[PDB]
Amino acid sequence: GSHMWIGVISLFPEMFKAITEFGVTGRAVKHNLLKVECWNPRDFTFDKHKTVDDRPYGGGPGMLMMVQPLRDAIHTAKAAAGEGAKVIYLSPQGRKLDQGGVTELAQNQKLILVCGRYEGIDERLIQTEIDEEWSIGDYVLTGGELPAMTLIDAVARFIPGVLGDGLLDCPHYTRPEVLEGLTVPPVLMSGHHEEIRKWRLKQSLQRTWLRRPELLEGLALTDEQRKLLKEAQAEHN
Amino acid sequence: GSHMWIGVISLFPEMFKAITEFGVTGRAVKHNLLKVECWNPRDFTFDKHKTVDDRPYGGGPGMLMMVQPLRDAIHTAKAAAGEGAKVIYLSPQGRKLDQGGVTELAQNQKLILVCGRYEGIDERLIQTEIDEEWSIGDYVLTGGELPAMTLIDAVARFIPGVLGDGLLDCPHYTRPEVLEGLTVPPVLMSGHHEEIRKWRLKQSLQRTWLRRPELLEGLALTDEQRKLLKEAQAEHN
Ligand SMILES: NC(=O)c1ccc(NCc2ccccc2N2CCOCC2)nc1
């Protein structure tokens, strides 16, 4: 319906099986709400040894991706996407991913995700081939594959059919009623819907407050939420 | 040598092939610097339909992981790890992952990673079975598998043998010398090692400053770095 097409440039396309063949993302794929198409720069080399890396100008420890096979793979993917596909490079230098960014990215019907390996890609390719850099967080990984997959899984949740607000989740409980002495909170057994809604909300406000206070600053809380937050805080002191 | 053992509890162990069979992490695995062992809660069920989910107390939209098969899988993994294994739950409510956290986590020789599906796990299991909650970032995914894999890849980089400071990376360049009109910066061709070191460092300082200014506040810059930052800023105005 409002499905999504995602192109992937990667030296390890088979990695993407982790999201295409399992769980919710796997189902989204099989029901054609999500399409993940991979192009491997190795297929675009011409030398006998299928070389995909190259030496950094200026010396240095590592390698970069070799420009020609990487550039060609990107062009082929763009031609498959038609007009309107946004090309994203996953990197530490990129805009930090958060839920607002995920909802932004989900608006696009077509994405091309370029996954860096070695010490990354030539600076000039970013300028000519890439629309936006994104980071999933302030940490270094061996490849852009996992951040690509992470991005894909996150936006996939916003596609209609795939499934069935500033705050951390409340605690959840299932069977049994007593577990290693710990009991389930009586309000959740009471059956009183509205009392349950308020407890969960208070919990979220309390949990957000104690674990991630800065998240509360971005929010314009409701009167109810202000009340429920004030209460939780009173009970804490 | 200083190898690492990682236990994984997951309804989709085959997802972990993305890191165990490819690239640098794949090599670390094959050379026995890294070991990733999976236990699937589905194997610990006893009913005919191998049920791994259960109904939330208090009503609500989704399901949680069923406590018994999840709890049993965790216990089996702990017994495989012996003493000293830290059990981590990947979740949005967790401590935010960043490089400092990765270097912290890398200190452990044994990790058990519990991957939530559905609306997650019973609150009481966190209290009894989990040592630390971690988040890879402020975004929601369909499973803890990708955040687990992300964690694994990140700490793996700190194991000796696996491979060959507050700032974003400098630009990188490889062949050709001219690409769509864009040339490689002459300093990188000059062969002057020390001039090259300073340019790369200035770039990092400039890039960090323009993209992620707050990262600069955490740092106690060197005199050189203060000088190189001041310069970059002068040239910007
Ligand atoms: N946080 C993220 O979004 C993220 C993304 C990728 C990534 N690695 C891929 C990568 C991409 C771009 C540049 C360098 C690199 N790396 C190459 C391998 O060496 C480290 C540098 N790491 C983290």
Ligand SMILES: NC(=O)c1ccc(NCc2ccccc2N2CCOCC2)nc1
């Ligand atoms: N940022 C992270 O580290 C991260 C980790 C996991 C994750 N999802 C697994 C999960 C784990 C715990 C609780 C709920 C859930 N989810 C179940 C699926 O529905 C959403 C809630 N998402 C993001």
